Curated annotation (Swiss-Prot), chain A:
Motif extent (Tryptophan repeat motif): 376-392
Effect in UniProt of substituting residue 104 to S: 5- to 12-fold decrease in affinity for dTTP substrates. Strongly decreased RNA-directed DNA polymerase activity. Slightly decreased DNA-directed DNA polymerase activity. No effect on RNase H activity
Effect of substituting residue 61 to R: 10-fold decreased sensitivity to ddATP and ddCTP inhibitors
Effect of residue 180 to E: Drastically reduced incorporation of phosphorothioate nucleotide. Loss of pyrophosphorolysis (reverse of the polymerase reaction). No effect on RNase H activity
Substitution effect: residue 379 to A: Almost complete loss of RT p66/p51 heterodimerization. Complete loss of polymerase activity
Effect of residue 388 to L: No effect on RT p66/p51 heterodimerization
Protein name (database record): p51 RT
Variant or mutagenesis effect after changing residue 384 to L: Decreased RT p66/p51 heterodimerization
Result after altering residue 147 to F: 10% loss of DNA-directed DNA polymerase activity. 22% loss of RNA-directed DNA polymerase activity
Outcome recorded upon mutating residue 179 to A: Strongly decreased RNA-directed and DNA-directed DNA polymerase activities. No effect on RNase H activity
Effect of residue 51 to G: 64% loss of polymerase activity. 57% loss of RNase H activity
Outcome after substituting residue 242 to A: Complete loss of polymerase activity. 25% loss of RNase H activity
Mutagenesis or variant effect for residue 161 to L: 80% loss of DNA-directed DNA polymerase activity. 23% loss of RNA-directed DNA polymerase activity
Curated annotation (Swiss-Prot), chain B:
Entry's localization field: Virion
Domain Reverse transcriptase: 43-231
Consequence of changing residue 498 to A/G/H/L/S/Q: Complete loss of RNAase H activity
Span covered, complete protein: 601 to 1153 of 1447
Effect of residue 536 to D/N: Severely reduces exonuclease activity of RNase H. Probably also reduces substrate binding affinity. Modifies cleavage preferences of RNase H. No effect on the endonuclease activity
RNase H type-1 domain residues: 431-551
Note: Error-prone enzyme that lacks a proof-reading function. High mutations rate is a direct consequence of this characteristic. RT also displays frequent template switching leading to high recombination rate. Recombination mostly occurs between homologous regions of the two copackaged RNA genomes. If these two RNA molecules derive from different viral strains, reverse transcription will give rise to highly recombinated proviral DNAs.
Domain characteristics, as noted in the entry: RT is structured in five subdomains: finger, palm, thumb, connection and RNase H. Within the palm subdomain, the 'primer grip' region is thought to be involved in the positioning of the primer terminus for accommodating the incoming nucleotide. The RNase H domain stabilizes the association of RT with primer-template. The tryptophan repeat motif is involved in RT p66/p51 dimerization.
Name of the protein in its database record: Reverse transcriptase/ribonuclease H
Assembly with partners or alone: Heterodimer of p66 RT and p51 RT (RT p66/p51). Heterodimerization of RT is essential for DNA polymerase activity. The overall folding of the subdomains is similar in p66 RT and p51 RT but the spatial arrangements of the subdomains are dramatically different.
Outcome of substituting residue 164 to D: 16% loss of DNA-directed DNA polymerase activity. 24% loss of RNA-directed DNA polymerase activity
Species annotation: Human immunodeficiency virus type 1 group M subtype B (isolate BH10) (HIV-1)
Site, as annotated: Essential for RT p66/p51 heterodimerization: 398, 411
Chain intervals for the UniProt region annotation (RT 'primer grip'): 224-232
Length: 406, 551
């Protein structure tokens, strides 16, 4: 076949990222996978004149391991090739559909050869234990999974293969983000999964092997909830006054005068204050301003998406997506009904938020994670199932905004 | 035309080879170069080149007080040579080595000179022996092998050695070979004679590829002085530590000292370096004299006593479990040992990072576990069982209320005090029948004067004046004042997001003395509930103490 010429941004060097240490279990699994990938010609061993590196991880998507390559750095340095040039446009309707199924189509890329000049930039290293050996060094001969240039190069073949199916089903929306197809329809569930199986069989008969559905209709921005007590203490009103004051930055028009009036004096926190008629109306009026949605919040495609996550205890995790502070494009809550632990829940929550973000805007958000860097770097693969990896940083400051979003 | 296959080398794009001129030298130093070069030329290592080669690189002739050695300053060529895959930055840790019946250490002689250099790159290695007082043109040579001191030599040698070793490694699967620099470390669990036969085979296998190796009479014997370690057949330890005694200490003196102490921490249990390290905080210059703290003097003395005794570590058995145990040594300082059998320690270590101004013990214990986890993965390829002096009730309460996600390994409680515990727990609901203090504090940013006050439900009011503080430090001193003048149960109400955040984190050790005093009060108290309200919003108790402190 014919390789598509690939170039990095002019004046940009390849990735030189550190390979993380791995357990012997994951190392052996990587050597098995790569030995057979080498036999199949998809990767080749490289010499010391190749200085580039990209980290590799062993996960499970499950008795069989799989290799996951963190191409985040190479993707940043190739952005001219997978965006602007050969960019795959994002349909605004996928979020509107009632059912969306995600299809792993990443195995297609291993047919297409990679530009021989660009292959040195995909170099990776299987690490040794205790620095006893130099790592095992490979580079890719075919389009690698996780590199954003792989779906861009394959885009023409994918459009061709899907052209009959899109003809037969004109109201089904199909969007490709990296290694996955997102297929959305307003059909009935069992009728929707039939169309999904048809598409799968269509793909399989054309040589594209493929191995829980989303429902964007239910998603929304959550409204701020206020409590309802049968008897309110001074402390209860204070927290009620503080929460309404925090919301005064986003929703204009929340009033606290009648509520503050009930606390005039130097009262004991434990004292029981009756809700006057005038304050009950203010609390009732404010319960309606929070029902209405905010205005003026528009997604800018030129700006990064940011996702913050708070641990609320009891397996619950709130989150907010935004681009400029206090302008939340999406808020939501995740709930682990599980055998669970904090890392498993955060890892699962990050994948849910990223998938929701892929559906709505077509790009992954940057995560501010409430966890210590080294702990995340040690255990994040233990529950990682997606084939992509978002950017993240570690918020060491606590949220006193924990109970606000609770 | 060499058996070993060359690695293709390129210069950085847009650069040319070095054109550095050769400085004139003595007729006696020229005599040394001329003789060394004709021997290197006879050995094919270098070749004379025509006049068309436009590149040069200086050469010098040194000797130590005595055959001379040739020295080439490749600094300019190195700058223009492409990058290579990074050679082993880290080295193996002795506690990760698996115990072997026999172990052999072989060093490769003229390692770099035994590997060919890419033909197209040889032009850029040209150098010149100077003629006596420029009487004639100098002799132009170039390298055909990996030059010593060139950027690419270590990486290309290591790869060439790897490939050269692959045939022998197939026909001998039980023999284990480790590579480091010009060394091979060979270990087998075969019979000493059988192992000795195999070594002699590998020597000839390497000699056939051109790699000189020592004979059985010239091979080093245990104990091996390897990278600051002593390797005995059944034990490892560090090489002897020499902590100097000095009347005055420079910044550089202390940096040497903490380095040696850090080095001792891997096998010597109980080493502490925090107080000494604090001296280097903001250390401007290496020559700056640092007055030793009384705490640094005691820390150093304690270290001297531990080092007086001798300790050793054991090698690794993959068939026995890996166990890690942590002990608290002092406020902020922790120590650990990792062992498979009860009193045979593989290695030891410390952890003493505060990771911020204020922390708690359970958080620091979790961080020490995290540091051991990363270290066990690097050294042994797995995480160990943990024996920890904390009870499940303590840790479970903490990690459940802690706002960060945390991974708690499988661990057993070992009752060997000091046990890690929660010294206090704030109330989660306000307290009935406890006095409600409304605290506030203020500070003029210019004059740096301040005050902290309280107003209570029972009608009590107080203001204490403050000399040199900030708005933040007074907001903390206002909470301290309410704790000082309250019963065993108190409800405190502040408008300070700063002070609430510090207290809600429930620290038990801080580098601020005021916070340490609040911590002392929080312990003595039976029930403390801390509440927050938006400032300047007319809330009853906050408005009064705000007006009081503002006057
Ligand atoms: N100098 C040096 C040096 C450096 C390194 Cl990186 C390794 C090394 O030795 C081994 C090499 C390979 C293996 Cl597979 C095990 C080794 O040692 C395992 C531990 N041990 C060490 C000695 Cl000295 C011994 O007599 N018996 C024994 O069991 C020697």
């Amino acid at each position: 076949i014919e390789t598509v010429p690939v170039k990095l941004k002019p004046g940009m060097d390849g990735p030189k990222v550190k390979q993380w240490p791995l357990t012997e279990e994951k190392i052996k699994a990587l050597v098995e996978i790569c030995t057979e990938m080498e036999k199949e010609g998809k990767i080749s061993k490289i010499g010391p004149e190749n200085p580039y590196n990209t980290p590799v991880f062993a996960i499970k998507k499950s008795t069989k391991w799989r290799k996951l390559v963190d191409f985040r750095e190479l993707n940043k340095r190739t952005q001219d090739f997978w965006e602007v040039q050969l960019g795959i446009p994002h349909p605004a309707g996928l979020k509107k559909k009632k059912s969306v199924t995600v299809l792993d189509v990443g195995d297609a890329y291993f047919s297409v050869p990679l530009d021989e000049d660009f292959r040195k930039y995909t170099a990776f290293t299987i690490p040794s234990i205790n620095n006893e050996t130099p790592g095992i060094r490979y580079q890719y001969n075919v389009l690698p999974q996780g590199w954003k240039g792989s779906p861009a190069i394959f885009q023409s073949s994918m459009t061709k293969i899907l052209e009959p199916f899109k003809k037969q089903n004109p109201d089904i929306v199909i969007y490709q983000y990296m290694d996955d197809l997102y297929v959305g329809s307003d059909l009935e569930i069992g009728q929707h999964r039939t169309k999904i199986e048809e598409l799968r069989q269509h793909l399989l008969r054309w040589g594209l092997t493929t191995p829980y559905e989303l429902h964007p209709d239910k998603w929304t921005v959550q409204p701020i909830v206020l409590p309802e007590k049968d008897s309110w203490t001074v402390n209860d009103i204070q927290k009620l006054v503080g929460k309404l004051n925090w919301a005064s930055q986003i929703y204009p028009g929340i009033k606290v005068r009648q509520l503050s009036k009930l606390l005039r004096g130097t009262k004991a926190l434990t004292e029981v204050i009756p809700l006057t008629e005038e304050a009950e109306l203010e609390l009732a009026e404010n319960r309606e301003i929070l029902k209405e949605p905010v205005h003026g919040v528009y997604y800018d495609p030129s700006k990064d998406l940011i996702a913050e996550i708070q641990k609320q205890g009891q397996g619950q995790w709130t989150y907010q997506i935004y681009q400029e502070p206090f302008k939340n494009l999406k808020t939501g809550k995740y709930a682990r009904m599980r055998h669970t632990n904090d890392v498993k829940q955060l890892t699962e929550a990050v994948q849910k938020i990223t998938t929701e973000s892929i559906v709505i805007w077509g790009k992954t958000p940057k995560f501010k994670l409430p966890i210590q860097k080294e702990t995340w770097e040690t255990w994040w693969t233990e529950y990682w199932q997606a084939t992509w990896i978002p950017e993240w940083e570690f918020v060491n400051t606590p949220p006193l905004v924990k109970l606000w979003y609770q | 035309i060499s058996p070993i296959e060359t690695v293709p080398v390129k210069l950085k794009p847009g650069m040319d080879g070095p054109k550095v001129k050769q400085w004139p030298l003595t007729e006696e130093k020229i005599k040394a170069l001329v003789e060394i070069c004709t021997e290197m030329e006879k050995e094919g290592k270098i070749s004379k080149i025509g006049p068309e080669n436009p590149y040069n690189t200086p050469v010098f002739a040194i000797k130590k007080k005595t055959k001379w050695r040739k020295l080439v300053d490749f600094r300019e060529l190195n700058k223009r040579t492409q990058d290579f895959w990074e050679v082993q930055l880290g080295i193996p840790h002795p506690a990760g080595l698996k115990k072997k019946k026999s172990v052999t250490v072989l060093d490769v002689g003229d390692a770099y000179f035994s590997v060919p250099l890419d033909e197209d790159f040889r032009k850029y290695t040209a150098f010149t022996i100077p003629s006596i007082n420029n009487e004639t043109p100098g002799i132009r040579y170039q390298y055909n092998v990996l030059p010593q001191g060139w950027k690419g030599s270590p990486a290309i040698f290591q790869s060439s050695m790897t490939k050269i070793l692959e045939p022998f490694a197939a026909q001998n699967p039980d023999i284990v070979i480790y590579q480091y620099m010009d060394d091979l470390y060979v270990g087998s669990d075969l019979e000493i004679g059988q192992h000795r036969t195999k070594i002699e085979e590998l020597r000839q296998h390497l000699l056939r590829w051109g790699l000189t190796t020592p004979d059985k009479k010239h091979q080093k014997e245990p104990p091996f002085l390897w990278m600051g370690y002593e390797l005995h057949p059944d034990k490892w330890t560090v090489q002897p530590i020499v902590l100097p005694e000095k009347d005055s200490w420079t910044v550089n003196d202390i940096q040497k000292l903490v380095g040696k102490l850090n080095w001792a921490s891997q096998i010597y249990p109980g080493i502490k370096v925090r107080q000494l390290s604090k001296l280097l905080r903001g250390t401007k210059a290496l020559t700056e004299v640092i007055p030793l703290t009384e705490e640094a003097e005691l820390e150093l003395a304690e270290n001297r006593e531990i080092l007086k005794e001798p300790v050793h570590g054991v090698y690794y058995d993959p068939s026995k479990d890996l166990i890690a145990e942590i002990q608290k040594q002092g406020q902020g300082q922790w120590t650990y040992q990792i062992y498979q059998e009860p009193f045979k320690n593989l290695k030891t270590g410390k952890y003493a990072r505060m990771r911020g101004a204020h922390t708690n013990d359970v958080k620091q214990l979790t961080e020490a576990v995290q540091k051991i986890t990363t270290e066990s993965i690097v050294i042994w390829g797995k995480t160990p069982k943990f024996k920890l002096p904390i009870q499940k009730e303590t840790w479970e309460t903490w990690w459940t209320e802690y706002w960060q996600a945390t991974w708690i390994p499988e661990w057993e409680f070992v009752n060997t005090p000091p046990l890690v515990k929660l010294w206090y727990q704030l109330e989660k609901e306000p307290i009935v029948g406890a006095e409600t203090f409304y605290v506030d504090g203020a500070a003029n940013r210019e004059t740096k004067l301040g005050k902290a006050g309280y107003v209570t439900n029972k009608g009590r009011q107080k203001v204490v004046p403050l000399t040199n503080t900030t708005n933040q430090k007074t907001e903390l001193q206002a909470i301290y004042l309410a704790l000082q003048d309250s019963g065993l149960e108190v409800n405190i109400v502040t408008d300070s997001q700063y002070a609430l955040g510090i207290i809600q984190a429930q620290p038990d050790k801080s580098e601020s003395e005021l916070v340490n005093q609040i911590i002392e009060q929080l312990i003595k108290k039976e029930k403390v509930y801390l509440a927050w309200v938006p400032a300047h919003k007319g809330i009853g108790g906050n408005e009064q103490v705000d007006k009081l402190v503002s006057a």
